[PDB]
Symmetry: D2
Subunit: 264 residues, 4 copies
């Protein structure tokens, strides 16, 4: 019979001059109805991690099979690009950095390739983004600066900016990532907003989910407080737990129904 | 055939020179086993409110009947004293105030009377306290300044301090809350105080749309930064009775776990 | 400052020759744009009860205010007609009975009046029905015999059939429920009926301590065996308002998802 | 390295009863290496047919769930252990009861339990011993609790094989095959029949145990779990019953832990 499946493949990036793996979830109907188009969720991993973690430890396919069957989530393409690895040798991060223009890769190469190949609807209304930790920050800032591309953002234990609680080499990959995250602080972006920016932020649906024992809780609180104070509607949840995969797996049961609601 | 019940009665306070109404939940076994003793939960109402609201809108009996039957909560006495009413006419608050020493009434009159009359076990390990809004602040500062009396505190949408006519009762309450800021109490703590705070189990529950969220956040950060174990939950919602009724499903099993 | 509201009003029924009370929930936006139309949920009460019980004990407005704010429910009209009262003095039931043609009242008088008066969109894709106990059986059989009218059915602790003087209202109701057994309707279905049933989304929610659990199990088993998709939940609890109030948090997001 | 941490350990015990090395996987609390004198309650957590001992740790994520629930106080620290009772059903013995040529229950009670509870510092009484499992393991847990009520205070049965389903059973026409032998064993030890045929003495024994039955609305074993619950209720034996969304799958069994672990903690 027909079944949802997880596929891992690769795309060569001219921007990065590098092979880029990615892992994709394909709905049960994908091979059955060759004409059907789908919403898409870009689902980003955290630092040190690589593309397969959402399928393998997040159990994306099993959660989707549950929620699709109950109607709580719609069939959608879910994809996780590789933006990680051993931080000492491999570039971690989602923004354009000196020597590593990941964001340019994401929008000019990755997204076009994926949405063509996996039959994504292709409009803003059916494109959402979510992620954990470093990926939560990437998801959030992508939503902030590309509000014309995303209808919803679900930020898990997100690296909204660098916590208050340092590499010896200021020119190492992790040092470069640190400065990139600071420069693109999701908190700062909201705090410095004029009325036009506030109005754009309001065109996006936001959901912030971070555990009470998480070292990034304080930065997510600042993000939520800035949003709430700026009059930008935003859901905020602080559940039991910390910076771990039980938090991120369980977050999927809130995330997938949330983006489904916004898609519709 | 035995059933849990809610009873409303009054105590005369010499300390206050005033009748004080209170509403108490009595477990299903109360009339069945006349010799059984129970743990107690003091469950405080918010500003403007009076004693019956936890039974009438919180549906305390219905929730207990559910959670006692599943084993998630133990049988306990639950009691709500009157500490409010129209804020322009009636005294609102839990701390000793000029002319209205509510806290002295609570500890020297109310508590001894309740625990004798309704067969409360009577020690610290079997006494907990919780409340919403003004009552959440009252529960918290009571647990802070009387850690010898309580094993657990569950603070709902709590008036931990004032969010961002000096002879009025409302002005007097306001000064009392600032003076007894639950946030300040943790922030100024020395090592001895931190050790005392650690002897109590703390649970802080406040909605993402609540005007008191920022103060509760301040309280949790102070606790966490001082190394005092504390659960924090921010659930969907605001300063309302759906939040406080649903909080009972976390609070009653929580104090049950802490009870010895 | 627009607010959602609950309104109780009355309609005269020629079919019944009786005044019929009803209670309706109106969305926050109702008075704000007086040309906006809404989907509708018919939300039925149980035996002995009357129309206002869903607003008063089910806290329908407070639950809607929560779920509308979070986006989990859409704005909808919610309406509860009176179909009960003291069973010894007042007619209880939702089907056409000898001397009391309530179903005829419902479809020929009540529904048209309500959907015109309160700006209901008016098609099947935006009409759903739910109920508890007697009202759960009523909702289920309405959906079964009027699949052209309802896209979704949410049955709480439903009187799917009688669990296991002759001219009293109670005896007449008892016969009516047996004659219109929700279980029977499914077990005797041919291929065309099964296809009709599949055009409706079904959700069945009944607690593990409920005296009607066995009839709901029979109903679900019949549905499942006939290949008619149906969600089934058995949660902790019994035939009580904590069950029915909490069911709302599953029911309202469910019909919202089904609404086209 | 500067922290103590809960641990999952896999080891083997040689069984003389079975003439077989029996692997097992055990969860050890964060305090295990830190307070060498602490004794613990124990939960026996059993796997399903076709599976082996490591599945509860690897797919159930038992360590991660315990680390969460221990920190919140919802679960107490406890030893959790899964013995190997499975593997490929055409090659390996599957099952929990004594069968011809494979007396697994005798192994469990006379070899496995004493060895585990000594080695991993279990308190060792009924009041601190619980059992749970999924599918085949759910039937194993339930019937153990039924016939060894003096050993267990609580049973949590997930998607349990309470008896052979009217539909969905694995074909077992070869009477000398291990799968046929298991099938007969499950029938003879029907969890449903055990309650149905109970006299007053048996009912009293059953009431000394806390029972929790948890099975999804789309599970092929739902109908048998319903019969078990109905028999329990009708017999006046207190039992929790939940039917949640889902089927015979690991999302159901992982999420079940979040009810199971606090549940046995309450009963301990
Ligand atoms: Ca916590
Ligand atoms: Ca909210
Ligand atoms: Ca129950
Ligand atoms: Ca289902």
């Amino acid at each position: 019979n027909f079944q949802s499946k997880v596929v891992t493949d690769t795309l060569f990036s001219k921007v990065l001059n590098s092979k880029r793996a990615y892992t994709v979830f394909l709905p049960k109907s994908f091979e059955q109805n060759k004409e059907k188009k789908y919403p898409v969720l870009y689902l980003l991993h955290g630092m040190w991690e690589t593309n397969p973690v959402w399928a393998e430890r997040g159990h994306v396919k099993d959660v989707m099979d549950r929620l699709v069957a109950s109607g709580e989530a719609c069939e959608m393409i879910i994809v996780t690009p590789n933006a990680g690895g051993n931080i000492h040798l491999e570039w971690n991060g989602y923004f354009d950095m000196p020597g590593w223009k990941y964001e340019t890769f994401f929008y000019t190469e990755f997204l076009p390739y994926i949405e063509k190949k996996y039959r994504v609807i292709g409009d803003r209304q059916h494109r959402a983004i979510a992620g954990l930790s470093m990926g939560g920050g990437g998801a959030t800032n992508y939503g902030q600066r590309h509000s014309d591309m995303f209808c919803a953002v679900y930020a898990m234990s997100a690296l909204m900016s660098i916590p208050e609680q340092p590499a010896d080499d200021p020119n190492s990959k992790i040092a470069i990532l640190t400065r990139s995250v600071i420069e693109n602080s999701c908190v700062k972006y909201v705090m410095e907003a004029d009325e036009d920016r506030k109005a754009d932020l309001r065109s996006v649906a936001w959901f912030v989910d971070c555990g009470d024992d998480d070292f990034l809780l304080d930065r997510n609180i600042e993000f939520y407080q800035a949003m709430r104070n700026a009059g930008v509607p935003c859901q905020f949840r602080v559940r039991d737990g910390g910076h771990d995969w039980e938090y991120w797996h369980s977050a999927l049961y809130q995330c997938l129904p949330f983006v489904t609601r916004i898609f519709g």
